[PDB]
Design a protein around this ligand. Structure first.
Ligand SMILES: [Mg+2]
Ligand SMILES: [Mg+2]
Ligand SMILES: [Mg+2]
Ligand SMILES: [Mg+2]
Ligand SMILES: [Mg+2]
Ligand SMILES: [Mg+2]
Ligand SMILES: [Mg+2]
Ligand SMILES: [Mg+2]
Ligand SMILES: [Mg+2]
Ligand SMILES: [Mg+2]
Ligand SMILES: [Mg+2]
Ligand SMILES: [Mg+2]
Ligand SMILES: [Mg+2]
Ligand SMILES: [Mg+2]
Ligand SMILES: [Mg+2]
Ligand SMILES: [Mg+2]
Ligand SMILES: [Mg+2]
Ligand SMILES: [Mg+2]
Ligand SMILES: [Mg+2]
Ligand SMILES: [Mg+2]
Ligand SMILES: [Mg+2]
Ligand SMILES: [Mg+2]
Ligand SMILES: [Mg+2]
Ligand SMILES: [Mg+2]
Ligand SMILES: [Mg+2]
Ligand SMILES: [Mg+2]
Ligand SMILES: [Mg+2]
Ligand SMILES: [Mg+2]
Ligand SMILES: [Mg+2]
Ligand SMILES: [Mg+2]
Ligand SMILES: [Mg+2]
Ligand SMILES: [Mg+2]
Ligand SMILES: [Mg+2]
Ligand SMILES: [Mg+2]
Ligand SMILES: [Mg+2]
Ligand SMILES: [Mg+2]
Ligand SMILES: [Mg+2]
Ligand SMILES: [Mg+2]
Ligand SMILES: [Mg+2]
Ligand SMILES: [Mg+2]
Ligand SMILES: [Mg+2]
Ligand SMILES: [Mg+2]
Ligand SMILES: [Mg+2]
Ligand SMILES: [Mg+2]
Ligand SMILES: [Mg+2]
Ligand SMILES: [Mg+2]
Ligand SMILES: [Mg+2]
Ligand SMILES: [Mg+2]
Ligand SMILES: [Mg+2]
Ligand SMILES: [Mg+2]
Ligand SMILES: [Mg+2]
Ligand SMILES: [Mg+2]
Ligand SMILES: [Mg+2]
Ligand SMILES: [Mg+2]
Ligand SMILES: [Mg+2]
Ligand SMILES: [Mg+2]
Ligand SMILES: [Mg+2]
Ligand SMILES: [Mg+2]
Ligand SMILES: [Mg+2]
Ligand SMILES: [Mg+2]
Ligand SMILES: [Mg+2]
Ligand SMILES: [Mg+2]
Ligand SMILES: [Mg+2]
Ligand SMILES: [Mg+2]
Ligand SMILES: [Mg+2]
Ligand SMILES: [Mg+2]
Ligand SMILES: [Mg+2]
Ligand SMILES: [Mg+2]
Ligand SMILES: [Mg+2]
Ligand SMILES: [Mg+2]
Ligand SMILES: [Mg+2]
Ligand SMILES: [Mg+2]
Ligand SMILES: [Mg+2]
Ligand SMILES: [Mg+2]
Ligand SMILES: [Mg+2]
Ligand SMILES: [Mg+2]
Ligand SMILES: [Mg+2]
Ligand SMILES: [Mg+2]
Ligand SMILES: [Mg+2]
Ligand SMILES: [Mg+2]
Ligand SMILES: [Mg+2]
Ligand SMILES: [Mg+2]
Ligand SMILES: [Mg+2]
Ligand SMILES: [Mg+2]
Lengths: 249, 112
RNA sequence: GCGAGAGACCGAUAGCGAACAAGUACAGUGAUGGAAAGAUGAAAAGAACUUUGAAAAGAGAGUGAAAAAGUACGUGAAAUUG
RNA sequence: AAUAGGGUGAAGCCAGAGGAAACUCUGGUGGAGGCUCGUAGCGGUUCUGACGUGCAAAUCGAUCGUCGAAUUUGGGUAUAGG
RNA sequence: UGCUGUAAAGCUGGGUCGAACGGCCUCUAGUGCAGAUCUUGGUGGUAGUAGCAAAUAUUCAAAUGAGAACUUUGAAGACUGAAGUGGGGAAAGGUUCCAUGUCAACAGCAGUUGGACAUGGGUUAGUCGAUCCUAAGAGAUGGGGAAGCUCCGUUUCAACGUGCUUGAUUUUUCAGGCCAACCAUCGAAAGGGAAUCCGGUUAAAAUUCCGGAACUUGGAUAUGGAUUCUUCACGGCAACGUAACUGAAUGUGGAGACGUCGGCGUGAGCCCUGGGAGGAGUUAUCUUUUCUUCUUAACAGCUUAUCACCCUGGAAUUGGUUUAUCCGGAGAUGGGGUCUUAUGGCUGGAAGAGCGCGGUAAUUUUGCCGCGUCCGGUGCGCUUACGACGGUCCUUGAAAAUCCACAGGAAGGAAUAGUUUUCAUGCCAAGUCGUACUCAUAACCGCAGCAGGUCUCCAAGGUUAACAGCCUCUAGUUGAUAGAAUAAUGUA
RNA sequence: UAACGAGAUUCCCACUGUCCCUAUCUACUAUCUAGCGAAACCACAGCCAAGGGAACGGGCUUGGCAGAAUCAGCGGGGAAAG
RNA sequence: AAACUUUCAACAACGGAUCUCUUGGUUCUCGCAUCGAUGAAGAACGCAGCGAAAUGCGAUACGUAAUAUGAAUUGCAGAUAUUCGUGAAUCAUCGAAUCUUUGAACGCACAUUGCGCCCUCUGGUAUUCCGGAGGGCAUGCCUGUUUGAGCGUCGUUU
RNA sequence: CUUGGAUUUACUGAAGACUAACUACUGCGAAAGCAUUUACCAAGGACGUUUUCAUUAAUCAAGAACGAAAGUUAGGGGAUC
């Protein structure tokens, strides 16, 4: 047969992300002396739309502690953050929406976003619109914090990892139907080349494991082993179960 | 009516290939190539157009006198009047409160 | 590659693709592909001159051993043709 | 970079009428939409028309689809033979 | 012309021809053709046959010539009908451009003509492009893979400046003061971007030449003005104004710099139209008539605006206000001002130019003279530019070079004199490459002068909703083998 | 299943040369001329009937017959060409 | 009976076989060891009195010098060309030179005749700007020189 | 379901519901309904009144608000039944 559409994406010729209009990478500040020992104050200059992103971004200006210079940061805007607001980041920052605090400095039940998986990676968890991270508890002896991720998973993170207080702005986006193929076209025009999708069952046997037949049908189980190889992993990969989800999981 | 042609090799209606139609002293209708319209100098605080400053294409500011490019005030050609006024009042009031917070702190550094 | 001497070899549809302004003309976007084409006469002596014609040419003449050698050039087969 | 001229008439807004209230009705205004008729354009339904040693190794004529967007298109650029 | 042999063949007469060749005994082989849809070359019948029929359409005369359906000129009849059969360009071609000569071949008839053939001529730039910038991307270096051709990576685990700015020194040595996040390079003749216009001129070039009038950048540099004894100016309540009117490192901003649609407003060009001053046409009759000229560039000065802003004042009986309902104690309405100069007006440029007439010069290079070139109006008009608005998106609609302002306060500054080229005037320079022509029913690609394909700009009158269809003006073509007839069968 | 469809199908109104059943007209061909001038195809060729025969002959056998050179049409045959 | 068709012969066509040639090819043998950063092989563009190509050459351009030789070259023309001679022609020979723009190709770049920087001289009233002439500036590696870096490290002095 | 240690035992944790006993011929609300603590928000009946207004009222076709459980649509939760 032929190389299937799954495998052509790794080469990344026409499958790279369309990034001309993007407004910068959304990251926290580099963890420095001020954030480790006290707090540093910045001011929100802009709240802007980032193409390909549901969450708006905030442009926050900080002073450089060591040279006469202004540093502009690109944060993910939490809902309620406004232009001209003062943003405080550090160990001694107060528990206000938009402030960046270490996870150990936040009491249980604190809603936090753009949380660091590892100390200083500048934000990994809960970055999309309407999403957040809940702080479950602390383990001060081991310097660890328990959090709940938007997927429902419980994670143990260093208490020195940082997060931004509040919920990511732009939530409720999925509640409205797109209603049109053109709307999805414009949605993916600034994301990547993944739309529209032809069904593999509608192809020929060269194109896909599902192609061929005198009727459109998969022919074999569409649940594929985790240990299958590239060109085989088309369908439900390592599916623990199938069918309509009934009851609680 | 007389019809005109472009005066340059560019045949396309691009942003830099805009023309006007002008009648010459020879009684002819010719195309006159129009330079791109200048944009106004704007405030760095509020983004509004600054008054008293000439609207020129950026290289033309080098060849014009200084009175065209500035206003006789602090932040003259950079900030508008209202944004400078707000800076002055904010600087004065905030620094006044800095003294108040200092003397008050010294009041709690000798009795508590 | 350079320099030589040879052959029971081929003799211009052969022998190298190329005996010649041949890796030329020409084709292809490109990698590449790639021909055809030698011979008047010892010597141009390559036909002065007259005449018919708009001219090309023709008819006389002239050169030559030969024009049954005139560059559409040694010989000049067959198909095909008057 | 390009895309006549019409039809329909969504929100929002103005005025009037009715009602105890919750609210309802009418006339305008407005100018929405992968809306619609229809040019340029893009496409290519049918005649199973012409042609079918063609004008053409896919064209010609009428008829037709669509025609403000998942639109059409120049140039630059990327992806290369299991 | 015959003879010999069963035969494969051998020999011979005549003609043609011009330089080598044969018999016999042996040797040797790339050694014998009717075929292989054989190979290469050549030639027939078909056959003077199929055919040379899309794109409305030609005709008379003269000239030229040996020769004219086809060339030239004149007269006419037509068509394209401004989304053109008009006038330019990008790609591509490459001399096809122009003049002269010229007809063997080519232009599927012809040819005196030609994009053919031959000989010459022709492309003029500081301002138009390239050049420079960065885009998607391409790609060296330090490194790391790979047997290697080379692959990855683009500042990457790097000691990465051929650094600058000054006071200089004339001691051709220096003294230092700042920084070195990022930063090789290539990548757009449609993106970004320093600066030019009008009139004239050639057989063929022109935003390039000539005449005149400007502008930008780089450099040098003096005078005037400005400023200083209160050293680095004044005025205005303010918005802010001006001829100027210090400002290092470093920093902050702005411009470059940005979708699309809708109606509205303003301008420009075009369309329409009145008077007057000219010219042409019609005139049996009518028509103070029909057509036409009456124009004004870049650049300089003054003035000119929606929006926005400032001062005054204090608002319900709410008012102002758009086609579109938004605004006002976060200060409306009212009154008075400030600003951007888009755009228009006046003046200079500039009437001296161009245009329209009339009168004269002459084989005549080329003219010379006189007069006029003026004053308006109109709009749901067309196109286009701009403006203030409004709608729209799970879509929010490049970058960089480059230029400016501001913050900062380093350093340097006067009185018998000091400073500055962001005020005026003056001086010098601007290199390299492209530039002709076609851009298509004949200059490109489809084997070709092929009904195909190939990006874009300008756009008159009537009818009309209309940039449709139909007719016409300017411009351009009248090209497509032709003649005679008009059966069948066609095609439309 | 409203709306939509150059999708497939049945019926009805309107409409008509689709038909009964054909006729007439126009232009361009065809046609004839001057000039220009291919190609497919071709063992040899080219009248029938029967016979036998590789069982459907242009040729063979037996008969019918049979008279130069040809033009426009035509599509039975050449088990026509590709 | 003509015409027409077919056959044959003569002459003339069409065409280029046959014959005969041959500065070419092919194969065998013998001898030799010599490309390039001192810039090769290759490419592009030019160069002649009148040349398009081939051949030769490089702005010194169908060639300059030198050695040898000894009267040509030739299609035409023409010497401020030559003949008992420093003398015609000559890739005869060849030891000195020239050798455009390139190319491993070397300042950077190259779909550009694009853009720098350094030294000396020179023109424009110029250490700085503009013009011209000449000479330079690639990378890896080796030896050496100089200038450096690192509490890697030795000695000494508080 | 259980020798792979079930059931049982102690400690710890997480989820959702639900508010026992107190709880009654007791309370509140227009009805449906309402039961852990505290805070906040706005209501309400009765009582008291030598306050106030003076007929403003009763019931009501049309028309409205609320309306157990089950059920429907879309998110979230889904312990127990
Ligand atoms: Mg899907
Ligand atoms: Mg699908
Ligand atoms: Mg299929
Ligand atoms: Mg398969
Ligand atoms: Mg399978
Ligand atoms: Mg299948
Ligand atoms: Mg299916
Ligand atoms: Mg000013
Ligand atoms: Mg030999
Ligand atoms: Mg040969
Ligand atoms: Mg050969
Ligand atoms: Mg011969
Ligand atoms: Mg004669
Ligand atoms: Mg002879
Ligand atoms: Mg002879
Ligand atoms: Mg001969
Ligand atoms: Mg013969
Ligand atoms: Mg429309
Ligand atoms: Mg068609
Ligand atoms: Mg058909
Ligand atoms: Mg036919
Ligand atoms: Mg149509
Ligand atoms: Mg493209
Ligand atoms: Mg004889
Ligand atoms: Mg003989
Ligand atoms: Mg001979
Ligand atoms: Mg012999
Ligand atoms: Mg043989
Ligand atoms: Mg043969
Ligand atoms: Mg043949
Ligand atoms: Mg033939
Ligand atoms: Mg014929
Ligand atoms: Mg035809
Ligand atoms: Mg004529
Ligand atoms: Mg017409
Ligand atoms: Mg010409
Ligand atoms: Mg001809
Ligand atoms: Mg002819
Ligand atoms: Mg020619
Ligand atoms: Mg320019
Ligand atoms: Mg340049
Ligand atoms: Mg990049
Ligand atoms: Mg390396
Ligand atoms: Mg570049
Ligand atoms: Mg450019
Ligand atoms: Mg842009
Ligand atoms: Mg440009
Ligand atoms: Mg001009
Ligand atoms: Mg011209
Ligand atoms: Mg000039
Ligand atoms: Mg200057
Ligand atoms: Mg002053
Ligand atoms: Mg908008
Ligand atoms: Mg608009
Ligand atoms: Mg200008
Ligand atoms: Mg004037
Ligand atoms: Mg107007
Ligand atoms: Mg337009
Ligand atoms: Mg100045
Ligand atoms: Mg030109
Ligand atoms: Mg064509
Ligand atoms: Mg070709
Ligand atoms: Mg137009
Ligand atoms: Mg039209
Ligand atoms: Mg024709
Ligand atoms: Mg005819
Ligand atoms: Mg339905
Ligand atoms: Mg349908
Ligand atoms: Mg459809
Ligand atoms: Mg016929
Ligand atoms: Mg039989
Ligand atoms: Mg028979
Ligand atoms: Mg037969
Ligand atoms: Mg017989
Ligand atoms: Mg037949
Ligand atoms: Mg027929
Ligand atoms: Mg021979
Ligand atoms: Mg370039
Ligand atoms: Mg109780
Ligand atoms: Mg009760
Ligand atoms: Mg009721
Ligand atoms: Mg209910
Ligand atoms: Mg649910
Ligand atoms: Mg459940």
């Amino acid at each position: 047969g032929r190389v299937i559409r799954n495998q052509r994406k790794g080469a990344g010729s026409i499958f790279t992300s369309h990034t001309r209009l993007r407004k910068g990478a959304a990251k926290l500040r580099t963890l420095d002396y001020a954030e480790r020992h006290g707090y540093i104050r910045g001011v929100v200059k802009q709240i802007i739309h980032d193409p390909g992103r549901g969450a708006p971004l905030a442009k926050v200006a900080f002073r450089d502690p060591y040279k006469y210079k202004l540093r502009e940061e690109t944060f993910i805007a939490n809902e309620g953050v406004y232009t001209g607001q003062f943003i405080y980041a550090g160990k001694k920052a107060s528990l206000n929406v938009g402030n960046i605090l270490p996870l150990g400095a936040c009491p249980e039940g604190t809603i936090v976003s753009n949380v660091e998986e590892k100390v200083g990676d500048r934000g990994a968890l809960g970055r999309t619109s309407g999403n957040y991270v809940i702080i479950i508890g602390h383990n001060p002896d081991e310097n660890k914090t328990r959090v709940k991720l938007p997927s429902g998973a419980k994670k143990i993170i260093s208490s020195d990892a940082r997060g931004v207080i509040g919920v990511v702005a732009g939530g409720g986006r999925i509640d409205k139907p797109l209603l049109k193929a053109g709307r999805a076209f414009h949605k993916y025009k600034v994301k990547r080349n993944s739309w529209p999708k032809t069904r593999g069952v509608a192809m020929n046997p060269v194109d896909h494991p599902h192609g061929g037949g005198n009727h459109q049908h998969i022919g074999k189980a569409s649940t594929i082993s985790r240990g299958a190889v590239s060109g085989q992993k088309a369908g439900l990969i390592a599916a623990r179960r199938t069918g309509l989800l009934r009851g609680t999981q | 009516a007389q019809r005109v042609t472009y005066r340059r090799r560019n045949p396309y209606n691009t942003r830099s290939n805009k023309i006007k139609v002008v009648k010459t002293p020879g009684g002819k209708l010719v195309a006159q190539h129009v330079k791109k319209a200048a944009s106004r100098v704007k405030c760095g605080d509020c983004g509004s157009a600054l008054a008293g400053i000439s609207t020129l294409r950026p290289r033309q500011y080098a060849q014009v006198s200084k009175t065209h490019k500035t206003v006789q005030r602090a932040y003259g050609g950079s900030r508008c009047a209202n944004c400078v006024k707000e800076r002055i009042v904010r600087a004065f009031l905030i620094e006044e409160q800095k003294i108040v917070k200092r003397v008050l702190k010294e009041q709690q550094d000798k009795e508590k």
